[PDB]
Amino acid sequence: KEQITVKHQLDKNGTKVPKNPKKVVVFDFGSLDTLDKLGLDDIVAGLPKQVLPKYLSKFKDDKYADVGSLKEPDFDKVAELDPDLIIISARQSESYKEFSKIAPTIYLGVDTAKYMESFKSDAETIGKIFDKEDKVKDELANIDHSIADVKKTAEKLNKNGLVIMANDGKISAFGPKSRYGLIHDVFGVAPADQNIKASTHGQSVSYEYISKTNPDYLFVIDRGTAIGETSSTKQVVENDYVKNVNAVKNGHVIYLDSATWYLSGGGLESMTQMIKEVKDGLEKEN
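^ that's the sequence the OP posted. Answer follows.
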């Protein structure tokens, strides 16, 4: 069977994978949605179905094996499927060795310090494996065009933005190079606070922090909503304390699709969606 050498984060010298694999187990939802965009649903053997973003609900179909959750893979079930390729990302990073004993495994997570570089590389890798290089090239081109358009819109406004995630009432902030840094790094929104320490969990902040930052646009992700726990966005954004924040009083709170933003991202479909949510937010009147 014809093989292709795939350089990835967890083996920069390259992992041999079969060309046109037929039984792929996918633990990265971005990668899953790239496969979907390329019309490759048929070769997905399994994915973790514990929680699925709405745009991926089709994958509840029993033709796809449930291999657990993003943080708790059902390794025996993965092995049972006799997969010919496994795709993982950051949440399974430490289990690379375990997955590799089952089948060739590649890591396709975005590097938020180098978002577009890693995004394009991941997509192109999928293109090469499944003989969809031209389709990927064209899709990346359209995405670049959409990104240029949102960036132009963001820069026209002369306004800034703060990105926060709510989690059972606790708030954390995300700036450049962070998990949700792309809103600034890629989409061009000026950061209301350049100095937020980049991380995956975000910088813990208070309501007083939102007030002192006074962002013109407020991008909100709700971790609770994403994972099926209680939402806590309204207690934050409709709190009396921040009623005078620009984003709040001017109606520029942008409620992102939390499930997609938290559980997914980094794929052709999720990126397309994410651009449009930001663009729509930035284009709203008032």
